[PDB]
Design a protein around this ligand. Structure first.
Ligand SMILES: [Zn+2]
Ligand SMILES: [Zn+2]
Length: 324
């Protein structure tokens, strides 16, 4: 049958013709655990750069829709919520990006992870780019693995802003982040702060502290990427109200009870695979975060993205969001 719509009643209550246009980067994070962020109680400073950003909000009580990228990513952009979510048919539902595009918001998705897991499939091919290879990513030569880096997704974004100047814009950066098993490959060597590091692709053969250290070094690289994304947004704050939303797609098991990696069914998965960090920053009070300890899930993402662009829609109007 046809695409199943959920927000045909969506309306944008203020337009970029009547107020300052809005430019948002949504970092779609990867494999990051809430309990390895110092803001949430971790006894190591894994986010030192974000710790120094004025106006950076951290959300300490967020849990994911699921435990893998294929499962969680479509749910993050869904109208259905985790309880009604069906991974098999998510591709055939109107999602929040479809709504925003229909209402005139520019949508761009750069992917240094895998792909959009069906989220971008109805939208024009010109709105999605594979940043896992040097065909598009200019930052793949900073490490001996030739692995393309998340910071490469920021290069050239000014051309996109110029081509859509004066419109509202939402840019998804799907980062490699902390995906394993080979955490040691996920960061350039200026982030090799904690030692010893487990150097291999079979984590069950790692000594425990060396496994943690490799994982935490990868978090330092993500701290840096998010900080640089905020720096990029700041270069546009004269002409746009700017904001950055970060949410990880799921956590990671690090050997607790013999469990590694992620992907367990929600009915069985340990809390480590579900408790995820989330951050929000904006340049001014056009947006206001909700309380940092609000109990939230991935169901909060769709209403947040709508609120960022002053869009209302009946399907999610009583949902808690990351902003007021
Ligand atoms: Zn995975
Ligand atoms: Zn993932």
């Amino acid at each position: 049958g046809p695409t199943i719509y959920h927000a045909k009643d969506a309306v944008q209550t203020t337009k970029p013709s009547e107020r300052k246009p809005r430019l948002v980067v949504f970092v779609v994070g990867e494999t990051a655990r809430a309990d390895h962020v110092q803001f949430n109680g971790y006894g190591r400073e894994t986010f030192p750069q974000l710790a120094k950003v004025d106006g950076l909000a951290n959300f300490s009580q967020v849990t994911s829709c699921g435990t893998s990228t294929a499962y969680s990513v479509p749910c993050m952009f869904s109208y259905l919520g985790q309880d009604d979510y069906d991974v098999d048919t998510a591709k055939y539902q109107e999602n929040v990006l479809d709504t925003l595009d229909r209402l005139g918001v520019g949508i761009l998705w750069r992917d240094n992870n895998s792909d959009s897991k069906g989220v971008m499939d109805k939208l024009p091919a010109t709105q999605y780019f594979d940043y896992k290879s040097a065909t598009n990513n200019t930052i793949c030569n900073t490490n001996p693995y030739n692995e393309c880096r998340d910071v490469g997704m920021l290069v050239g974004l000014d051309d996109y802003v110029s081509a859509n100047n004066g419109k509202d814009m939402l840019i998804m950066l799907h980062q490699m982040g902390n995906h394993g098993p080979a955490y040691f490959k996920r960061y350039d060597e200026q982030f090799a702060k904690f030692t010893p590091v487990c150097e291999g692709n079979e984590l069950a053969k790692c000594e425990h502290q060396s496994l943690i250290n490799a994982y935490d070094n990868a978090l330092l690289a993500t701290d840096d990427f998010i900080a640089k994304s905020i720096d990029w947004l700041k270069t546009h704050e004269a002409n746009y109200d700017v904001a950055m939303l970060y949410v990880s797609d799921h956590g990671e098991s690090l050997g607790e009870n013999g469990v590694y990696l992620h992907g367990m069914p929600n009915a069985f998965a340990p809390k480590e695979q579900r408790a995820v960090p989330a951050f929000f920053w904006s340049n001014n009070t056009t947006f206001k975060p909700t309380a940092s300890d609000t109990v939230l899930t991935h169901d909060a993402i769709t209403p947040t993205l709508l609120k960022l662009f002053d869009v209302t829609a009946g399907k999610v109007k009583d949902r808690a969001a990351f902003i007021q």
